[PDB]
Amino acid sequence: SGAIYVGNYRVVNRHLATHNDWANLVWEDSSRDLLVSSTTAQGCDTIARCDCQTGVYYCSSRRKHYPVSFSKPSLIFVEASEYYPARYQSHLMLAVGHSEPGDCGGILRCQHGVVGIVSTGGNGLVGFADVRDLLWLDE
Numbered sequence: 001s002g003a004i005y006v007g008n009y010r011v012v013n014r015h016l017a018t019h020n021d022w023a024n025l026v027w028e029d030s031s032r033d034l035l036v037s038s039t040t041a042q043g044c045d046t047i048a049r050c051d052c053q054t055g056v057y058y059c060s061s062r063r064k065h066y067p068v069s070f071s072k073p074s075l076i077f078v079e080a081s082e083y084y085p086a087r088y089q090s091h092l093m094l095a096v097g098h099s100e101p102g103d104c105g106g107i108l109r110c111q112h113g114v115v116g117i118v119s120t121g122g123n124g125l126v127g128f129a130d131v132r133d134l135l136w137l138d139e
C-alpha cells in the first residue's frame with residue numbers, strides 16, 4: 001500500500017483503490033495502473049518534473065529505502081493477476097531491485113521530488129508507474 005498526496009488529490013495504484021477513491025474519482029487509467037481521487041485537505045508532496053533515471057524507492061517488504069537506476073517510461077508486458085488480464089502497461093519504468101505484491105504504493109523519489117509509485121515486480125526487477133507527465137496534479 002501507499003499513496004501520493006498533492007494538493008487536493010490522492011494518487012494510488014488503480015488495483016488497490018478503495019470505494020472512497022471510486023466515489024471521489026477524478027481520473028483513472030487501467031493501462032497505467034493509476035487512479036486519482038479528491039481529498040478535502042491540501043497535501044504537500046512535490047511532484048518531480050524531470051527526465052531523471054536515478055532515485056530512491058521505499059520497499060515495505062524490507063522496511064528499507066533503495067537507490068536505483070531506472071528505465072525511461074514505456075509499454076512493458078505484464079503477466080496476468082486477479083486484478084488484470086495479461087497486457088501491456090504503459091508509462092512503466094523498471095529497475096534492478098526487490099519487491100513483493102504488497103510493495104505496490106511505495107514512492108520512488110529523485111532529487112526533484114516524487115517520480116512515481118511501485119506498480120509491478122518479479123525476477124529481481126521492480127516496475128514504477130511514472131507520474132511526472134501528469135502536469136494537472138499541480139494546477
Ligand SMILES: COc1ncccc1CC(=O)N1CCC[C@H](C(N)=O)C1
Pocket residue numbers: 015033078081083084089099100101102103104118119120121122
Ligand atoms: C510489486 O509487485 C510485485 N512484485 C513482485 C512480485 C509480484 C508483484 C505483483 C505484480 O507485479 N502485480 C500484481 C498487482 C498488479 C500489478 C500490475 N500493475 O499489473 C502486477
Ligand SMILES: [Zn+2]
Pocket residue numbers: 048049050051052110111112
Ligand atoms: Zn528532475
